[PDB]
Amino acid sequence: EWSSTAITDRPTVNMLGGYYSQQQFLRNLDVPSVMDEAYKEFVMQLASWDTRREFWLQTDYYKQRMVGNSKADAALLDEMINNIQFIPGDFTRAVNDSVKLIAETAPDANNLLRQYVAFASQRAASHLNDELKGAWAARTIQMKAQVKRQEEVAKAIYDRRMNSIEQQARLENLQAVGPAFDLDYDQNRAMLNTLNVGPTLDPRFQTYRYLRTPEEPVKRD
Amino acid sequence: EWSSTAITDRPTVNMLGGYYSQQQFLRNLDVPSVMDEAYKEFVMQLASWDTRREFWLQTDYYKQRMVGNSKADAALLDEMINNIQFIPGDFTRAVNDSVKLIAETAPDANNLLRQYVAFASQRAASHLNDELKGAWAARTIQMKAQVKRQEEVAKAIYDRRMNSIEQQARLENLQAVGPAFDLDYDQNRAMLNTLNVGPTLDPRFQTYRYLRTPEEPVKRD
Amino acid sequence: EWSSTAITDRPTVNMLGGYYSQQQFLRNLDVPSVMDEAYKEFVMQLASWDTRREFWLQTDYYKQRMVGNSKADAALLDEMINNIQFIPGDFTRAVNDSVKLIAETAPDANNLLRQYVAFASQRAASHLNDELKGAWAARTIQMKAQVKRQEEVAKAIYDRRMNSIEQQARLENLQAVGPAFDLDYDQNRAMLNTLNVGPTLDPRFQTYRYLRTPEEPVKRD
Amino acid sequence: EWSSTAITDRPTVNMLGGYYSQQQFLRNLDVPSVMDEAYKEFVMQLASWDTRREFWLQTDYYKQRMVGNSKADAALLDEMINNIQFIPGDFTRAVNDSVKLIAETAPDANNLLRQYVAFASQRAASHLNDELKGAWAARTIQMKAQVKRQEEVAKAIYDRRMNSIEQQARLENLQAVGPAFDLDYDQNRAMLNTLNVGPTLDPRFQTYRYLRTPEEPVKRD
Amino acid sequence: EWSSTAITDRPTVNMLGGYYSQQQFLRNLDVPSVMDEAYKEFVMQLASWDTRREFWLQTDYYKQRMVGNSKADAALLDEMINNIQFIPGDFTRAVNDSVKLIAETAPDANNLLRQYVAFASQRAASHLNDELKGAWAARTIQMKAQVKRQEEVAKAIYDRRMNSIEQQARLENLQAVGPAFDLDYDQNRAMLNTLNVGPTLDPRFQTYRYLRTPEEPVKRD
Amino acid sequence: EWSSTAITDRPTVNMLGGYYSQQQFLRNLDVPSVMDEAYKEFVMQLASWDTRREFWLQTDYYKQRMVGNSKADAALLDEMINNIQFIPGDFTRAVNDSVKLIAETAPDANNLLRQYVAFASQRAASHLNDELKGAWAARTIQMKAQVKRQEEVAKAIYDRRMNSIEQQARLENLQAVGPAFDLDYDQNRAMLNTLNVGPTLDPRFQTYRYLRTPEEPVKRD
Amino acid sequence: EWSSTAITDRPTVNMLGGYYSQQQFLRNLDVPSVMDEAYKEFVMQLASWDTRREFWLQTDYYKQRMVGNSKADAALLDEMINNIQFIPGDFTRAVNDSVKLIAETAPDANNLLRQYVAFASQRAASHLNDELKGAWAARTIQMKAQVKRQEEVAKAIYDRRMNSIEQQARLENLQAVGPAFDLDYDQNRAMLNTLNVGPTLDPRFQTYRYLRTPEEPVKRD
Amino acid sequence: EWSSTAITDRPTVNMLGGYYSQQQFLRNLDVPSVMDEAYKEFVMQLASWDTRREFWLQTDYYKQRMVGNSKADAALLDEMINNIQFIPGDFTRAVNDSVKLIAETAPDANNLLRQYVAFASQRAASHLNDELKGAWAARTIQMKAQVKRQEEVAKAIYDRRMNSIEQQARLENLQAVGPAFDLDYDQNRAMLNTLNVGPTLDPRFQTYRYLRTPEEPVKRD
């Protein structure tokens, strides 16, 4: 009987907090902006049937409307999932992305859509953070192997040279100094050191901004 | 009963002031125009429901029409949000963006449209500065860590040369000069300086230009 | 009752005087023809509601038809702005940009359209000049700072070397020669000099050529 | 009579576990996302007639409805293969891929679809690992041949130099040192070590993600 | 009443005479065929209202039909402008550009169209030279500045090495040679010579070619 | 009467065995995956009239339906060929390649489609091995000529050097060693070595995988 | 009454004779096959109204049909021009270029079409030869100027070096040796020579081949 | 009456014999596969009227049907040219090219279709051989001129080094030895030999493959 509508877009750099420069850090090591990628997760969370189901189940609004009939309670749940409607923008006609939520009173429509948007955002950020951890750890592992191969090339160059000099200053000298490492090696080594520190995983960042924040509707549907 | 019309297009370099040259500065480090991206935020602010809500709330126009009934004051707020109509252009057709505003008199429709355009532009600039602020800060920490790693590499190379000389002037010469630094270190350091100064926040800047300025309507709607 | 028509296209190189080589100068420092860009602004001026309004207000033709009533006078002005009709070309079809002006006599239709085309073109020129002035200024600021960072880089290196020669002739050599400047720095210094002269802003230049010049129509509309 | 629904999309990077780093490691040697290619396999598995057939064969649900007549049991299996329906998504219109499974009860339709999705996904992972195992193997054979050839090139140069210099320190050294090897050879050598260790096959991995997870339907079909 | 037809297409290399080598020369400095650009100007001239108007004014066919009454003559001139009809081609359907000219006799229709075509081509060839002359001058100025700057760099390095020596034969020595100029300065220098001489403006050249030459119609329209 | 159906897709890397790493080896020498290419030939074989005809002639099913009349037996053969129908997949609609086979009993439809799919696969495998054997022959001939050209160049340079020296250590020196061969020569020598071994031509490999395996139809057509 | 058809295609390399290697030589100096380019001129000639006109005027067949009435003779000429019909290929659906010719008897239709095709081909060759001759001149001139700038650079370097030395052997060296020319200069000098010889212009080459040669029709149109 | 059908596609590398390696040899100098280009020509030969006409004239089938009258035998030939129908494929729908041949008996339709396809293939191969010859020949001329020039460059250098030497050991060195020659020269020379040897001509090769071999029709059209 009453609805709120939100219209959203990509979050700003500031909103992404610690997430932004670590995802850029990783990118400028691997080779659609971070804020787009982040938004894409949000938009997926917002439209997801699962996201809508999990939201309602953790709501007082829903819980208070149960009657203890397994089957009427499942249908109520299904109705409520169908009362959150996401419409993908098409940007050919300046139509932005929007979500609408239907409920039985006006303050409920406003409060619940704001809460849903936050819920969708928190799930998105948790997820983008999962992906960051398993991109950081993977790049750490990859970098460890490269540095390890570099040690093993160096040592094999050292051993060849070691052999060749035996067959008296240069033997002892080379034997006390070890394998000869280039700048490439020393650079990768320092990069490992920051990588080994591990990412900062802050769960609080926002994953969208509002072009239209929900408000108490003034008339019924 | 009376409506004003405006027609906008993207700003120019001068319209953008200190923001332009700060934005290009940061693009020349991470390696569509700056004014296209300015205008895109402007158009977004212009169409925005939030922008319209907040414009009216700050208006003597809306305030003098308040009766102190909260429900009715909210309904009037909504009716006036719907009195500002944004119309996207289409470049296949060569139609520019245009915004309309309805009010109770001709002079009001004109002045209110001029204020609302200026209000939207100012919101766009603030947002653009916010982005800049936050991207500059990201880049600054990025550069800060790159120089640090640069210092650790030099220190590793130095220790190695320090052990290799132990195993007598060259020792004392090295023991006193510290680690050697490449041109790239000094250039980054000088780049860190200017970054540390931080950007010039100009809140002055226009984010659109008029092709058609609001004037007084000649007849009612 | 009577109308003229103009058909336009982009200005020739000669028609831009000094504006051309200067815009070229600035183009070939950062890495659609200059004449295309110029014509772009002209076309935008020619179609603008503001340009038509300002044109008529400045015309004796309009002034002689005023009756001293504010409303009647604003209606007449609005009617006149609508009497200048720009039709964008379809260059798939060899249809070019064209402009029609309706008036009450044949000589008026012709003289006015001529004056209108020149009025629009003058506004385009002034604006292309504000852009130029603001593009040169930005470039000069970026150049100064680059050179300044270059001097700070040479200074850090000098001090480092200085401090390294200490721990005797070559100390005095270094002490009297100052920092070492690369060719790149010297090129930047001379480029800077020409930039500090600052652009010549000739307001004259023309911003379109005629494919069809207005003439006195031989019959009524 | 009862039906469950699921909607899927491509898995994420950490959903792929060990598979992703290994496949990325291979692509880096021989110089469309890994998740895209994983999802493509998943989708092929989910739609596959063979996969449906083999899923019902291993199901207690099917097995408890067999009567031990080979014709009647083959007819039932057929009815049940046709009771899993894959419905291809459509990029043009933001429709995602989806699958429906029909069964004799509501709990069955839920459990079974969950089991089918997991079953199709384990088959996709088995397949991807198989591809990895085989591609990695060819890579390894290739690499061996390359190293072999580099050693035949170095031996040829050795003999030529050996023979040349005869016609005595340099002779005897040459005799002691063996062929000379460049950096690329030790680099390949070190790489060959890691290919020999063989890829670690993560058999646990997920090849899709849920947008909509099966639930017990509320009413009959 | 009596009409004639021409069909044209782009001119060939030899067709452009001495204009072609000149345009290629300038193009090989800053870094659609020259013949494409030329045809485009021809087609533009052929179709232009101004071109048709000026053609008829300069015609004996028109002058002999003037009655010495300004209005009656301008009406006749207008009817003649409309008696020349450009029909743009479409290169989707292998249709070439054609042009029709209607006149009071078959001989006239033939001669006039031939004259009109030659007139349009000559106006195009003047416009092309003009562009050349101006693009060329702009390039010389640019080139003058470039060399000028090269000398300021050369002098700065001179004065710095002069100062470095002061603080002996090598002094006086450097004092006699002057600044050291690289290969590139002398190259620019010799190019500047060929730029100063100025382009050759062949006024001779053709800007189109006939696929169908005008002939006397056999009958009336 | 009864029909079976198969749906197929590109073979895995594994099913290509020794063929894959050999097609790859040839691919890196000259400068769509190998498995796509393999599948392409399979699909060609599956749909070919010749392949269907050759298949049935080689079948007891056909031989047992012969009556010893040339006309009746040719007509029967033609009816069989028309009983194997191939439908190219439309990948945009997630519909894959499928082949259907009609026959007189359900077990016959199943077993013959299996044999037929295997028949076509084996024709594809032998064909791909003929392309291999001959691509290799082509590469091997070219390599030999390149090497021979290299020998004849070093010979020319040798003789040039030989005359010049005569006209005395280095004379007998040059005489005793021979023409000077660079590393690129030696790399080509080894590459030729491995080319002379010649490819392995395993006819055994598989050239499709099933997404739908033929099964006994449960009902007539 | 009767008609022949020919179908053509681009000429072979061989049919182009001496023209081919010369156009290739000018191609490899200016940094769409030659035979394609030649055929493009052929097809232009073949379709051309002027070509059909000039052909008929030069034919006994037309000359013999003249009656000495201008009007009747011109109408007959026009009628015969329209009896040569060219239809452009559509290469998407394997329809090649063709030309049809109508005449009053079957032998005439064959003979005249073979003549017309030969006539069109000869005009094509003559034109391509003019194109060539003018390209080879444009090129000779450019090389002449290039070599002359080179001469003047070397002289400037010589003069500068000559002076510096004055403030005794190597002076008299410089005196007698002259300016120092690079390999580039000498290569360009030798190219200049082959250019001065001038192209060969055999006007005999064929500019099409036939896929369908005209023949005597076996029935009336 | 009766007809046969053949379906064809592009040949495979082995089917091109000695032609492939030769065409690729020329191709790797000059800076669609060879089998595509081979196939392009077969298809043209197959569909060609000339090819169909000449095929029939050389057939016992046609000869035995001639009656010794020119008009009657020409009408027969024509009927038979129209009895070979080529049908291009459309690969959007996976349709291959196919050719049908009609005749008075079944055995004739089969044998004639087989002979016609081979006839067309033979013509294609001859044409491709001719192209290869011409292209080879031209390229030899080219290289002959390129070596000629290379010698003239070295000769000019020799003369200059000679003259500078004049104003005595090295004078006799240079006076005895000869002009100096770069690697490029000897490599070109070695290439010139293999070019002089000339191309090997397979008059043998196959220029298509069968997807459907003509067979005896079982029934009429």
Which helix (H) or strand (E) element contains residue B113?
helix B106-166
Of C47, C88, C131, the CB nearest to B14: C131
3-state secondary structure of B213: coil
What's the CATH number where F69 sits? 3.30.1890.10
**Amino acid in position D156:** A
Angle at E129 between CA E124 and CA E134, to 5 degrees: 130
Instruction: State in Å, rounded, how far the first CA of chain C is from the last one.
Output: 5
3-state secondary structure of E70: helix
**What CA–CA distance (Å, rounded) separates F54 from G154?**
78
Side by side, the strands of the sheet bearing C209-212 are C84-87, C98-103, C2-9, C209-212
Instruction: State in Å, rounded, how far the first CA of chain F is from the last one.
Output: 5
Chain E residues within an 8 Å CB radius of C25? 142
**What CA–CA distance (Å, rounded) separates A150 from G179?**
53
Q: Any residues with CB less than 8 A from the CB of G65 and at least 6 apart, and which?
A: G76
**Are residues F11 and F35 in contact, defined by beta-carbon separation less than 8 angstroms?**
yes
State whether residue B134 sits within 8 Å of chain A by CB.
yes
The dihedral over CA atoms of B33, B38, B44, B48, expressed in degrees to the nearest 10, equals 180
Greatest Cα-to-Cα distance within chain D, rounded to the nearest angstrom: 98
Of D13, D176, D183, the CB nearest to A134: D13
- Alpha carbon E147 to chain centroid distance? 28
Report residue F199: phi and psi, to 5°: -70, 160
Which helix (H) or strand (E) element contains residue E101?
strand E97-103
Which 202-221 residues of chain B touch chain C by CB within 8 A?
Answer: 210-213, 215-216, 218-219
Q: Any residues with CB less than 8 A from the CB of A41 and at least 6 apart, and which?
A: A124, A127, A128, A207
Experimental technique, in short, is X-ray
**What CA–CA distance (Å, rounded) separates H208 from H39?**
6
**Amino acid in position C23:** Q
**Are residues A72 and D218 in contact, defined by beta-carbon separation less than 8 angstroms?**
no
Under DSSP, the state recorded for E17 is T
Q: Chains B and C: how many Cβ contacts under 8 Å?
A: 65
State whether residue E107 sits within 8 Å of chain C by CB.
no
Interface test mutation site (partner H, options F73, F160, F201, max chain H beta carbons within 10 A): F160
Interface test mutation site (partner F, options H2, H9, H12, H197, max chain F beta carbons within 10 A): H12
Contacts 24+ apart (CB under 8 A), F57-61: F58/F119, F59/F112, F59/F115, F61/F103, F61/F108, F61/F112
Which chain G residue has the Cα nearest residue H127? G12
Angle between helices C18-30 and C34-47 (to 10 degrees): 120
Angle between helices B49-57 and B70-81 (to 10 degrees): 130
Count how many Cα atoms sit within 13 Å of the Cα of residue D164 in the half-sphere of its side chain. 15
- Cβ pair E145:C193 closer than 8 A: no
CB crowding H105-135: b at 16 or more within 10 Å, else e = ebebbbbbbbbbbebbbbbbbebbbebbbbb
Angle at F165 between CA F160 and CA F166, to 5 degrees: 105
Angle between helices D18-27 and D34-47 (to 10 degrees): 120
Of E190, E215, E218, the CB nearest to G149: E190
Of F21, F211, F213, the CB nearest to D44: F211
**Are residues A150 and A192 in contact, defined by beta-carbon separation less than 8 angstroms?**
no
Do A and E touch (≥3 CB pairs < 8 Å)? no
**What CA–CA distance (Å, rounded) separates E142 from E145?**
5
Instruction: State in Å, rounded, how far the first CA of chain A is from the last one.
Output: 5
Nearest CA distance, F163 vs chain H (angstrom): 7
What does the block give as tokens for C80?
């006149």
Q: Chains D and F: how many Cβ contacts under 8 Å?
A: 75
What domain range includes position H221? 1-190+192-221
CB crowding A29-68: b at 16 or more within 10 Å, else e = eeeeebbeebbebbbbbbbbbbbbbebbeebeebeebeee
Report residue B203: phi and psi, to 5°: -90, 15
Do A and H touch (≥3 CB pairs < 8 Å)? no
CA nearest to D49, candidates D76, D86, D103, D98? D86
Which residues on adjacent β-strands are paired with residue E172? none
State whether residue F186 sits within 8 Å of chain D by CB.
yes
Contacts 24+ apart (CB under 8 A), H91-98: H94/F88, H96/H7, H96/H8, H96/H9, H96/H211, H97/H7, H97/H8, H97/H9, H97/H43, H97/H46, H98/H5, H98/H6, H98/H7, H98/H8, H98/H212
Under DSSP, the state recorded for G210 is E
Phi-psi domain of F198 (left: phi exceeds 0; alpha: psi -120 through 50; beta: other): left
Greatest Cα-to-Cα distance within chain F, rounded to the nearest angstrom: 97
**Are residues A9 and A39 in contact, defined by beta-carbon separation less than 8 angstroms?**
yes
**What CA–CA distance (Å, rounded) separates A12 from B131?**
6
State whether residue G72 sits within 8 Å of chain E by CB.
no
What does the block give as tokens for E105?
């006799």
Chain D residues within an 8 Å CB radius of A160? 181
**What CA–CA distance (Å, rounded) separates G221 from H4?**
31
CA distances D205 to D26, D134, G53, Å, are 19, 18, 78
**What CA–CA distance (Å, rounded) separates H102 from H116?**
12
CA distances D97 to A43, D7, D121, E67, F210, Å, are 17, 6, 14, 81, 22
**What CA–CA distance (Å, rounded) separates D136 from A4?**
55
Chain G residues within an 8 Å CB radius of H138? 13, 20-21, 24
3-state secondary structure of C115: helix
Which residues on adjacent β-strands are paired with residue G90? G95
3-state secondary structure of G167: coil
**What CA–CA distance (Å, rounded) separates C149 from D16?**
47
**Are residues A77 and A56 in contact, defined by beta-carbon separation less than 8 angstroms?**
yes
| E strand map for B22-145 | 84-87, 98-103
**What CA–CA distance (Å, rounded) separates F13 from F17?**
7
**Are residues H159 and H174 in contact, defined by beta-carbon separation less than 8 angstroms?**
no
What does the block give as tokens for F215?
């099964």
Q: How many domains does chain D have?
A: 1
3-state secondary structure of F164: helix
